[PDB]
């Protein structure tokens, strides 16, 4: 038992991480087979970043302008191209450590592991959710661009995120691995803000089920509610609407615990209206919304 924010083991991604330098700008790239993927703003100078024209900036580079370092081995660049907001740098050596992998784009509300990197070197691993407003609440410092986010299924790494930038509020924005941004953000050092965020309701319910599975039952009650009456409360507290598909997804956890989804919604209603009166759930004094139903089942069941 116990319930912790848990990342996937990172070894398979660590063996893909390289350092990419253009001129005086450096960041991380992802080396799969004979291609290195990195944020395109590696080709910016500091004064290029307020209003870059990337197509112009790239036309003025050639292969020998990109220094790629895999450990203390330089990889020779033999081709380059732009794809949306990432660069594809063809190198002369296929990565011998390339895992089975997929490029997937995730939905808001879904989670993934971030391998934070600097200078091509992995620094730490943590778990993130894609917020409803398409930002992520990460931990990233200058030099971390090109760090990736991923999920692992069997021995297959599904890459879903590459890091680009930090917004003024301290949240983070990036692209999928085809270089398309999550959310209405651009890779420019301009005034930009995220849309209003909302709380991920199905995830809060999943975490409440994790809590019961771990023996925190104090917030439970004999009341039930209707989906309609619950969603009226959710909208008032800036929670996303709960769908019948969410109720279905929570099915297995509702079965395991014997607590009907709409019964658990009655608990969430009371917590929203009255708070926790000084108690905690799974060590938190706030309602947590960055665990998916899959994350709960995974951890409260043990898939290695």
């Amino acid at each position: 038992s116990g319930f912790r924010k848990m990342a996937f083991p990172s070894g398979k991604v660590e063996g893909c991480m390289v350092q990419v330098t253009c001129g005086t700008t450096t960041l991380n790239g992802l080396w799969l087979d004979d291609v290195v993927y990195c944020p395109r703003h590696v080709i910016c100078t500091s004064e290029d970043m307020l209003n870059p024209n990337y197509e112009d900036l790239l036309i003025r580079k050639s292969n020998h302008n990109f220094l790629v370092q895999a450990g203390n081995v330089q990889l020779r660049v033999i081709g380059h191209s732009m794809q949306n907001c990432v660069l594809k740098l063809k190198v002369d050596t296929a990565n011998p450590k390339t895992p089975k992998y997929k490029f997937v784009r995730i939905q808001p509300g879904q989670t993934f592991s971030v391998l934070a990197c600097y200078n091509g070197s992995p620094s730490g691993v943590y778990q993130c959710a894609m917020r409803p407003n398409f930002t992520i609440k990460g931990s990233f410092l200058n030099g971390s661009a090109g760090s990736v986010g991923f999920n692992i299924d069997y021995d297959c790494v599904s890459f879903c995120y590459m890091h680009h930038m930090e917004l003024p509020t301290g949240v983070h924005a990036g692209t999928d691995l085809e270089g398309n941004f999550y959310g209405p953000f651009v890779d420019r050092q301009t005034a930009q803000a995220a849309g209003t965020d909302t709380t991920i309701t199905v995830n809060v319910l999943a975490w409440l089920y994790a809590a019961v599975i771990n023996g925190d039952r104090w917030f439970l009650n004999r009341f039930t509610t209707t989906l309609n009456d619950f969603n009226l409360v959710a909208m008032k507290y800036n929670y996303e609407p709960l769908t019948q598909d969410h109720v279905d997804i929570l099915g297995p956890l509702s079965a395991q615990t014997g607590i009907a989804v709409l019964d658990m919604c009655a608990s969430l209603k009371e917590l929203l209206q009255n708070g926790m009166n000084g108690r905690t759930i799974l060590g938190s004094a706030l309602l947590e919304d960055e665990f998916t139903p899959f994350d709960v089942v995974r951890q409260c069941s043990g898939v290695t």
Partner: peptide, 8 residues
């Protein structure tokens, strides 16, 4: 305030 690209 402005966004920051996080190369170095």
């Amino acid at each position: 305030n402005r966004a920051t690209l996080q190369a170095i």
